[PDB]
């Protein structure tokens, strides 16, 4: 089987050269076309270019030229797809399609958000009402800058009615939601908490939910 997946890259300070590392080793070595598929959060699938290992011929496309190089090294069997002189529009999921009659062998992909930002910690605010059989719960997140965030409810014991809401953008700050439904026999009987985490700022915020 073509092992294993692609690598990860985080936000890099502007001016340095980041580098992806696409680690498909399913040899088949080394005569194929490693075409890199890139897709925005606008759900459109675009093409970043391909590379050929037997002689060394790369390619490019009009919306990603100058200077996205696709270097090849058959000793390590990796394909490099990072673009320098970048802007913030390169914040998109970056796949790795191998060559067949179609685009059959993809990778798993990585999203690389690049800017000159500041990593902000999250802050759990209690969403609790101040009557009926079941009440929906939740705790709002407001103002975390990089897209790594964590979603838990009771650390793996009340993950039934957790709806995963997107962090749509306003004022350059991500705002998602995580609402869970509780029955009246456990509220306010057991102490419910929500614990979110930010890997990029390495900050943990917790809050216990109280009836107001």
């Amino acid at each position: 089987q073509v092992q294993l997946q692609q690598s990860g890259s985080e936000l890099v300070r502007p001016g340095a050269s980041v580098k992806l590392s696409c680690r498909a080793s399913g040899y088949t070595f080394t005569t194929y076309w490693m075409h890199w598929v890139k897709q925005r959060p606008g759900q459109g699938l675009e093409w970043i270019g391909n590379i050929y290992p037997h002689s060394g011929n790369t390619n490019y496309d009009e919306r990603f030229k100058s200077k996205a190089t696709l270097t090849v090294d058959t000793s390590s069997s990796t394909a490099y797809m990072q673009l320098s002189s970048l802007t913030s529009e390169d914040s998109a999921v970056y796949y790795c399609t191998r060559d067949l009659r179609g685009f059959a062998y993809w990778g798993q992909g990585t999203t690389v958000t690049v800017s000159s930002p500041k990593t902000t910690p999250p802050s759990v605010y209690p969403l609790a009402p101040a009557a009926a059989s079941m009440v929906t719960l939740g705790c709002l997140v407001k103002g975390y800058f990089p897209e790594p965030v964590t979603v838990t409810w009771n650390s793996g014991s009340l993950s039934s009615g957790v709806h995963t809401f997107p962090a749509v953008l306003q004022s350059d700050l991500y705002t998602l939601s995580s609402s869970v439904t509780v029955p009246s026999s456990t509220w306010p009987s057991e102490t419910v908490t929500c614990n979110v985490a930010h890997p990029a700022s390495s900050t943990k915020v917790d809050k216990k939910i109280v009836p107001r």
């Binding site: 005569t31 076309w33 050929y52 037997h54 002689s55 060559d99 009659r101």
Partner: protein, 47 residues
């Protein structure tokens, strides 16, 4: 009279149909540049 001549041998069915006629021009390569002119081409038979 005049006596006559000119047998219809080339107006036959097999003399009109039997001629090596090209039906398809298959194209392939060794290094795959794109599709088409990829290696390994194919063609379902139709005349």
């Amino acid at each position: 009279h005049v006596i006559n001549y000119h047998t219809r041998s080339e107006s036959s069915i097999e003399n009109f149909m039997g001629r090596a006629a090209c039906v398809y021009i298959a194209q392939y390569a060794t290094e795959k540049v794109n599709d088409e002119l990829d290696r390994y081409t194919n063609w379902e038979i139709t005349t």
